[model samples]
Target: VVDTDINAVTNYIVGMCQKFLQKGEKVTPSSKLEELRTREDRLWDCLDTVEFVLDVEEIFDVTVPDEVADNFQTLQEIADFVVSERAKAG
Candidate 1:
């Protein structure tokens, strides 16, 4: 079974999003997240929902619950929700 330490996983997910999925062609540790929030439609359009989720799962090494897959929408919401679950899991 895969035991995902959710915070680390989610943080990693966020980092990946910030690195690859964010609007800019380049990313830094200090990159702003506003870019993500503002251009969400562009990001979402580039990535189909299933592909995005699969990439997240692959990046984080976690199996997201299908229920979460069914319901989760915004990237920010997914990141926020995972962060919360991480705290709970800890």
Candidate 2:
């Protein structure tokens, strides 16, 4: 089982967001999923959401269910899920 730190997980998620951000895009803990979308008009489409979720799974070493991924509306939601899932893993 994995023991996790919430703050550390949050920071790691934020870093991942920053890593994938395009020019002029910025990420913050409070940033909504719409802001994270790859294209302004596309919003959170399948490819974009899947890529983000895959990257998150890789970084956090956890699996994110389709339901949870589909419901993630904000960056904090993802971070919270990581914390919760890690606790379950532990």
Candidate 3:
């Protein structure tokens, strides 16, 4: 919960998903994005998948290949990559 980049990444992800939520629904840090997409309203359809991944790459200054990008179907994968790559960079 205290990782700087990791923490901010969750906020960014959550913020993006917020707009896609139904009037009766909401999101939190631990929410799984893919599930959000699959929900009845499929609110996640509102944003293009590539568009979201691109933003993550931009913010983290990291490249997530198409194969790996597809694996980021959950919260931890995306957030973990930021830290794991930073581990590589540092």
Candidate 4:
């Protein structure tokens, strides 16, 4: 069986990214996916690193320790980390 919670969480993450990072600018899926894949610095710039971490922690219902903060320098970096960490928590 599929997990709707996970789907909802993932979609929420994407929507948050689109809504805040893009700020209504025209962006394609491929472009956004690519941003998650390769150009993470640019993505980090868009998300604003500190706020992104707070948002991620809140959205995932996870508390990120101070040490972990440094790991979230980029969007893809944060996404991948959040997925793994949240899965571990579950």
Estimate the overall C-alpha local distance difference test score of candidate 3: 0.63
Q: What is the lDDT ranking, best to worst?
A: 2, 3, 4, 1
Worst 10 residues of 1 by lDDT: 29-38
Residue-by-residue lDDT tens digits, candidate 3, 1-90: 333467776677666656555655666766666556433565464244576778767766778888887656665676777667766745
For each candidate, what TM-score against the reference? Answer: 0.43, 0.77, 0.63, 0.50
> 1 or 3, which is superior by TM-score?
3
lDDT of each: 0.52, 0.73, 0.63, 0.53
> Of the candidates numbered 3 and 4, which has the greater lDDT value?
3
**Given candidate 4, what's the lDDT at residue 50?**
61
Q: List the lowest-lDDT window of 10 residues for candidate 3.
A: 37-46
- Tell me the deviation in Å of residue 5 in model 1: 12
- Write the residue-wise lDDT of candidate 2 on 1-90 in tens digits: 132677787777777776565656777888886756454444445667678899889867779999989887767788888888778734
Whichever of 1 and 3 has more lDDT, that candidate is 3
Q: Write the per-residue lDDT of candidate 4 for residues 1-90, one digit (tens) a residue.
A: 121245455555556666554444433322433344223334434235566678878767667677776545434455556666666734
Tens digit per residue, CA lDDT, model 1, 1-90: 122444455456556665445355443333343334323445343244566678876654446677777666556556555545545553
- Candidate 1 regions with alpha-carbon error over 4 angstroms: 1-47, 85-90
Given candidate 1, what's the lDDT at residue 21? Answer: 56
> What TM-score does candidate 1 get on C-alpha atoms?
0.43
Clashes of 1: 0
